[PDB]
Design a protein around this ligand. Structure first.
Ligand SMILES: [Ca+2]
Ligand SMILES: [Ca+2]
Lengths: 701, 707
């Protein structure tokens, strides 16, 4: 017996029922959706880019259709309506079965088709869809009411209509108030990711490829995979919520398998990906998680998902990110009485950088003022529910400390608002808090700018200025709704700068000391440089050195060191990150001075060049060039080319590139998208990876 | 490499590292060696008795957080305050860290401190020292490993792994500084210490009760609750948060695929499991889940609630099961439940697919809510029976019950869904042949009409509907509804002087019964009505299987008057077609000809299934045999196949069952088991019977066990 619910869950846009064709009367002979990509419909609904041959409109906006009948429509003795249905169990009640009534005028916010033209046996309609409509692929019918039952059109796949989110419709939640932001955030399918570190910002390109053939369907499939209730697919919040939860593969469910293990044995290294396109297609193709991804990889894929559906989204990169924060606002560094970092206890690392997504939508479920951008982090960490993605959290609520409001705001708030606490763990077992640094985590938050590949600084959007009461107010409120501060809080200054260097080069480092006091100090400063993964996780202390300083009053003292390429070269991890600690305990006052900086060695680039003709439908030759400036023969050197609208993503491995050898790969491309495009490449050998390169090509036609 | 995190997640209590017995460092030996440790953990002693952990059938020390307990450390030679530094340590998981609260160095201290870990040397006698140890009231809940370490200036020396000193530390409803603190003893006794509950079912005009064995103190249960959290990979540093324990624990009750305690099923057949109706308590279910390490088949709402209540009370979180009569489950935050009518007034059963549950059970867990503004602490509603929430198909809660009452549903967790469970409106709507729809009437008095829970006294019912909602009609309720509507609650549609209602006689399974409809014409107009009656056989969830009786009649209402119409429902009309729980649903809709006005009303009835008989003889004394006698007399005129009888009674017997391949009509079987009670005072024997057909049959017997 089916005793839990009378009608089973309607959670698959792919499944379908069989609507009966029977429940001088007027019977339809043909249906015309003006669905060509040059036509009024797709152009005005901004769905002309999608490599799809079905009508694709946006909710909350009218589109035209033409019904042809057996004989002409006569208002005196005829009743018909268009219907759109979705899922295996459509129900009017649940918005999955939609009868579009014939209306005189179209009413703001309701489904309705108005008879706009009548010629011979044809009726032209202007159909308006509700602005809170379910997003998915709807099946279309025409039903004709007669006095025994209803007559309806037969399953016609050619008329299937996609109704997406509508940033342009001012009555949609997704309503984005500006045409420029809409092109970037919804219509632009090439993105830029910021990596490296706060004082050496790296940039790389990503093919979001949302208009590529098969991506929209994979986006619906991702939802059918989460068995998402069709009745909720029209809520951008729930779509963000359920959708981000599918990015990271929990087991053998989810799009991407996460792994920061530097080898990536049974799959593709995260550094290898050029875009979300092959990933998603691999997912749909295989129906199994795609190995492997990391933060920017999950964020690249999720941004594709959101934009592809019509919710404006962007990727954000925070500098010095307190992930796995557990909503605590203190990251600890343990010092010995000696002034030396205790590496046994000090086990919480800050990420050099951490990307997540931002989704634009209103938040009617919240006090007014909280719409706009909502932070969504597909990279799980412990939240109130367990090991899951976080969000959507209103960036505005996070900025103000109103972290009680869903979803997972205390975690995102702590991701950018934590302090570093320097603590002396004594030889007797006790702990003594030495110093607190309220300016390292979330030092710089960044995302691609609207009119170009540049970087826009968005730090002030997640939080206020350090010191002023606004930041102080946000802090005092957060503390009340989920944020935690478990521990309560000599005239010498220390500081130090490392120097950015090219992979394989030596580099300086300098420590400055300034004693504004009128007494002589003797100190013991210590340097500890570790090889780290981008997450801050340390692998090994490649350089350790002890400094003995003797400051004089009113003195400024600078000391220098040179890290030699050989001290790190056989040990670096992908991304080539290095971390530095300079801790200094004075002697006469037993006080500690501590500082840390990270650095990444600037890594090589791929050379992409073109020749031949650059016109849509026209062959141009593209050459992928890699000059390995290293002293090791590079094994299994996979190279990858992408370029949304110019080429699909492709890969070629070169058995081994020997020292200072350039290898070349030309690929004959035939664009399908005119205008400003971009060629994208990556390279991941068997050791050296996270090597990128791009080429901007102009395609004509 | 594992570049994700420096140290793996500490999310198993069962996992353990090896703490070194000597961890020195530097250069260059009798400093104090522990000879032995004495936790004074006997069940009759003061540690367990004062920590109210003495009922646990567990020979390890079990203590509640935030309250001092005593230990004695016998050294190798007399502690000498002058040179010896030492202290107790508590560690949990494979990756303990002071930071996360999983490695806990308890400092020897001059005076116990409020809400901090410390041990005060309360005695010194020949090598031995006695300590009064106090745990922080925010301590992680679980079973910890105990060590004793001696600080030497070059590293430390410490005890080796000793399973016998493993100490469980639980939530403490008796500690004023514990988030779980409950004021008076009567409540703690009830919501924490009582291991037998009562579940309410049936329908609002016919409340049924049955006993349920929580058995939180029975052998194996504490460890199983720790195992549930381990199977959910629950971060150990979150096991000290009752809000999180409730959130994660409930999510573990319902089995999604092959993770979870119980596979829910509502199909009336139960092919490869035990019918949800057969279970007598949580014990055998939690122990099966632990042995097999796979989901137990099967459960329904009250079963999920029973098992979750055990889980909660076992860890130390006060909890109770609540029953909501006429529950709007699967609401999607909509406060509107639809009934579609045809133009003539009849109910349209193809369009009416939403059903109201005769009743629905969930749990309440008591704790402060520091994450929410003041006033939302106390009972938190948590429902482990899934429904579509903001995240997906999952359990809902904990949701401040005070937030639901005031409609402050923006506050976590899933408050809009629980608010709608109790506040939906039934909307009668006519579906016309031309396809359009017209709204006739909204009945705002059906759903959440009675919310009940067992009394602190004994087995009686406590009406707690007022804790979930204000009185119908007055200001506080309109406001609460106003506030909710702006934070997640949804009403998708906008809303002749004849009244109508009807009563249905409760019958015993197999007997005729009557239904009586009354119409009140409060106007001066004379009307003509055509009323319809549709009686459906249904599941407790309201899902109908078949219309067993339909009747349509014409009435002529005189101005200002009452008019009754009585209907006889003969047994023969429903007998061969009931579903377990024997629910019946009646719709009575009428249509007034002159005005086109619609009158509509609904009622449910459950047929009363006779009890099982339990008898005992002999010595009802702890450690002495008494023979229990359960006998069931087949009420039906049909023969029963594979009749299973279950017997239970925490402290009196472990759950058990025997099968009868067949019980011919009017026959009687008897099962007798010799029980050697291990718990004294007022106990209870509980039984159930479930066969290939008749089922949802229970019984019990109260017993006083002497000492
Ligand atoms: Ca800060
Ligand atoms: Ca009500």
């Amino acid at each position: 017996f089916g005793g839990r619910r009378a009608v089973p869950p309607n959670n698959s846009n792919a499944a379908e029922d069989d609507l009966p064709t029977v429940e001088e009367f007027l019977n339809v002979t043909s249906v015309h959706l003006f669905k060509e990509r040059w036509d009024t419909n797709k152009v005005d609904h901004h769905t002309d880019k999608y490599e799809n041959n079905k009508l694709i409109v946006r909710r909350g906006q009218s589109f035209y259709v033409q019904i042809d009948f057996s004989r002409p429509y006569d208002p005196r003795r005829d009743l018909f309506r268009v219907e759109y249905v979705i899922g295996r169990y459509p129900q009017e009640n649940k918005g999955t079965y939609i009868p579009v009534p014939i209306v005189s005028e179209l009413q703001s916010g309701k489904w309705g088709a108005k008879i706009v033209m009548r010629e011979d046996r044809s009726v032209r309609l202007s159909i308006q869809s509700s602005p809170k409509c379910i997003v998915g692929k709807f099946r279309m019918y025409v039903a004709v009411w007669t006095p025994y039952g209803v007559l309806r059109t037969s399953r016609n796949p050619e008329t299937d209509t996609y109704i997406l989110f509508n940033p342009w419709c001012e009555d949609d939640a997704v309503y984005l108030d500006n045409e420029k932001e809409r092109e970037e955030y919804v219509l632009n399918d090439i993105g830029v990711i910021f990596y490296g570190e706060v004082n050496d910002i790296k940039t790389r390109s990503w093919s979001y490829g949302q208009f590529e053939d098969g991506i929209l369907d994979t986006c619906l499939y991702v939802m059918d995979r989460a068995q998402m209730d069709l009745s909720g697919r029209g809520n951008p919040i729930k779509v963000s919520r359920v959708g981000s939860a599918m990015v990271n593969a929990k087991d053998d469910e989810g799009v991407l398998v996460g792994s920061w293990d530097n080898i990536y044995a049974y799959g593709v290294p995260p550094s290898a990906w050029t875009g979300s396109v092959d990933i998603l297609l691999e997912y749909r193709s295989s129906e199994n998680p795609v190995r492997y991804g990391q933060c920017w990889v999950f964020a690249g894929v999720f941004n594709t998902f959101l934009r592809c559906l019509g919710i404006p989204a962007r990727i954000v990169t925070n500098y010095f990110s307190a992930h796995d924060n557990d909503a605590n606002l203190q990251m600890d560094i343990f010092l010995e009485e000696d002034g030396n970092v205790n590496s046994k206890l000090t086990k919480d690392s800050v990420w050099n950088y951490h990307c997540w997504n931002e989704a634009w939508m209103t938040r009617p479920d919240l006090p007014v003022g909280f719409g706009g951008w909502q932070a969504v982090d597909s990279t799980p960490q412990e939240n109130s529910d367990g090991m899951y993605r976080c969000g959507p959290a209103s960036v505005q609520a996070i900025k103000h400390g109103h972290v009680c409001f869903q979803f997972d705001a205390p975690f995102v708030f702590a991701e950018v608002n934590s302090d570093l606490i320097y603590i002396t763990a004594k030889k007797d077992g006790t702990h003594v808090v030495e110093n607190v640094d309220a300016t390292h985590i979330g030092k710089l938050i960044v995302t691609k700018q609207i009119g170009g590949d540049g970087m826009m600084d968005i730090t002030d959007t997640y939080k206020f200025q350090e010191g002023q009461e606004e930041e102080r107010l946000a802090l005092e409120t957060a503390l009340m709704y989920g944020a935690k501060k478990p521990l309560n809080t000599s005239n010498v200054d220390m500081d130090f700068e490392v120097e950015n260097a090219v992979l394989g080069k030596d580099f300086k480092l300098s420590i400055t000391f300034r004693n504004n006091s009128h007494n002589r100090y003797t100190i013991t400063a210590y340097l500890s440089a570790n090889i780290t993964f981008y997450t801050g996780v340390p692998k090994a202390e490649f350089k350790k050195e002890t400094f003995d300083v003797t400051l004089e009053p009113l003195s400024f003292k600078k000391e220098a060191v040179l890290i030699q390429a050989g001290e790190y070269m056989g040990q670096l991890l992908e991304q080539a990150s290095l971390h530095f600690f300079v801790t200094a305990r004075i002697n006469e006052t037993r006080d500690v001075l501590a500082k840390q900086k990270s650095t990444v060695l600037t890594i090589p680039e791929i050379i992409i060049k073109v020749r031949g003709t650059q016109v849509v439908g026209s062959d141009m030759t593209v050459t992928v060039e890699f000059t390995n400036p290293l002293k090791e023969t590079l094994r299994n050197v996979w190279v990858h080319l992408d370029g949304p609208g110019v080429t699909r993503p492709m890969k070629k491995m070169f058995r081994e590139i020997r020292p200072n050898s350039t290898v070349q790969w030309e690929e004959v491309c035939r664009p399908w998208v005119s205008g400003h495009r971009k060629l994208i490449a990556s390279m991941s050998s068997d050791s050296l990876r996270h090597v990128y390169g791009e080429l901007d090509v102009q395609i004509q036609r």
